[PDB]
Design a protein around this ligand. Sequence first.
Ligand SMILES: NC(=O)c1ccc[n+]([C@@H]2O[C@H](COP(=O)([O-])OP(=O)(O)OC[C@H]3O[C@@H](n4cnc5c(N)ncnc54)[C@H](O)[C@@H]3O)[C@@H](O)[C@H]2O)c1
Ligand SMILES: NC(=O)c1ccc[n+]([C@@H]2O[C@H](COP(=O)([O-])OP(=O)(O)OC[C@H]3O[C@@H](n4cnc5c(N)ncnc54)[C@H](O)[C@@H]3O)[C@@H](O)[C@H]2O)c1
Lengths: 212, 211
Amino acid sequence: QAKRCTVIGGSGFLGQHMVEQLLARGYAVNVFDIQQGFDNPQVRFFLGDLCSRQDLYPALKGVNTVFHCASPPPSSNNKELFYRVNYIGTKNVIETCKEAGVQKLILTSSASVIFEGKPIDYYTETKILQERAVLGANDPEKNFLTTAIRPHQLVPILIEAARNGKMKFVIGNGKNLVDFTFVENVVHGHILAAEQLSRDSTLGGKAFHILE
Amino acid sequence: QAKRCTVIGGSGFLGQHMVEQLLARGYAVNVFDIQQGFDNPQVRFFLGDLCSRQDLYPALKGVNTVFHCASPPPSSNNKELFYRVNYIGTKNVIETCKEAGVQKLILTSSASVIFEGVIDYYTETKILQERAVLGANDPEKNFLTTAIRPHQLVPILIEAARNGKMKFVIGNGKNLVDFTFVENVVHGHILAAEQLSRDSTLGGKAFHILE
Ligand SMILES: NC(=O)c1ccc[n+]([C@@H]2O[C@H](COP(=O)([O-])OP(=O)(O)OC[C@H]3O[C@@H](n4cnc5c(N)ncnc54)[C@H](O)[C@@H]3O)[C@@H](O)[C@H]2O)c1
Ligand SMILES: NC(=O)c1ccc[n+]([C@@H]2O[C@H](COP(=O)([O-])OP(=O)(O)OC[C@H]3O[C@@H](n4cnc5c(N)ncnc54)[C@H](O)[C@@H]3O)[C@@H](O)[C@H]2O)c1
C-alpha cells in the first residue's frame, strides 16, 4: 500500500507510459480508465467514468498515490465534455480520494496553464480551474497532499527563479535519465515528485514545470 | 549601437552557437576570448583575458549588448582559478561595461546554483558570479542585467508561483522544434536580451530553460 497507486487515464498515451515505469519501480498499479486498453496482466484494470463516485471508489481503496492523467482530447472541441470531465469531474476525484484515504494525488496539468493573467482556449480554461481545484485541496495536517506537473504555438522558453529560498524543485539522478525519450522524461518527473512528496510535504499544492 | 553586441567566451562551445544565431538575426557581433577558435568572416575577434580592464574595453567600446558565457574548465579543479575568473573577473566585466555605455549584460549561469544549502567550489563561484551581475542591475542608469541558468545529481522539476510574482518569456516553438539542446539554450539567451529591451523588469532576475 506504500507501493500501491492508481493511474486515472492509465489506458491513454501518457497513462500507458506511467504504468510501464511504475511497474518497473516495484509499484502495485491499478488502472482506472473509461476505455479498456492493450491488456496488461500485471495491472488490476477498473473501467469507469471518473465523474462517477460509484465507479472510482473501489479502484482507490488500498492506494496511497493517485495519478490523474485522464482528459478528453483537446482536438475534439467538445466544450461540454471539457467542462464535465476536466472541471466538474475533478471534484469527484478529490472527494473520492479523501473517502478512500489516498495520501497523495498527482495531477497532469498543461504548460499553457502558466498564461493565467492566442493560447488561452476553453480546454486551457478547464485545465486552469482543474489545477486550482487540485492544489486548493492540499491539507497536510489531514495527510492529503496534491501537486500538478505541467508538460508541453506559444510556449514559455524561460521561467523566473526566486532567489528568496521560496523555489522548490525535484532532483533526479542523471545516470537513469539519458536513454529516456520525451514522454519517459515527463513520466519520470511525475514518479519522482510523488516519491519526494512523502519525504517532503512542503511540495504539496505547488505546480511544477519540466526542463531540457 | 542598437544592434551591436559582444560575446565574451565567444570561441567557447556555447559561444560558437550564440554567434551563429545572433548573426542569423543580423547582429553585428564582436567575440572576446583568450583563444581565437574558428575564424568567422563576419565576426570581429579581440584576444584577451576578461579580467584585464584594458584588454576588454575596446571589445565593448561602441556595442550595446554583452553575452558573458566565458568560464575556466570545470574539470580543472583549480579553486583559485575559478574564484579569479567567475567572481573577481566578472566584477571587471561589469565595470568596463558601464565605462563603455553598454545597456544590457546577459550572463549564462549554472542550473546547479539552485542546490545552494541543500555542490562544487566551481558552483559556489557561479553563485557569486550570478549575484554580482544581478546585483549590478540598475534601470535608472540604463544598465539592465539578467542571468540564464542552462543545465550527476540533476534537477528535473521547478515550482511555478501562481500569484503573478514570477515572469516568463514566450517563444514561438512552432519554429524552434528543429533546434538541438544548445540551439534552444542560445535562443533563450537571445529572446531574453530582445525582450529585456521591451520590459526592464526582467532586469535583476535569473531564469531557467523549459521543455
Ligand atoms: N503526454 C503529453 O506530453 C501531454 C502534453 C500536454 C498535455 N497532456 C495532458 O495529459 C493528458 C492527456 O494525455 P494523453 O496524450 O495520454 O491523452 P489520451 O487521450 O491518450 O489518454 C487520456 C486518457 O483519459 C481517459 N479518459 C478520458 N475521459 C475519461 C473519463 N471520463 N473517465 C476515465 N478515463 C477517462 C481516456 O480513455 C485515455 O485513456 C491531459 O491531462 C493532457 O492535457 C499530455
Ligand atoms: N551548454 C552546455 O552544455 C553547458 C552545461 C552546463 C553549464 N554550461 C555553462 O556554459 C558556460 C560556458 O560553457 P562552454 O562549454 O561554452 O565553455 P567552453 O570551455 O567551451 O568555452 C568557454 C570560453 O571561455 C573562454 N575564457 C576562459 N577564460 C577566459 C578569460 N579569462 N578571458 C576571456 N575568455 C576566457 C575560453 O577561452 C573558452 O573559449 C559556463 O559558464 C557553464 O556554466 C554549459
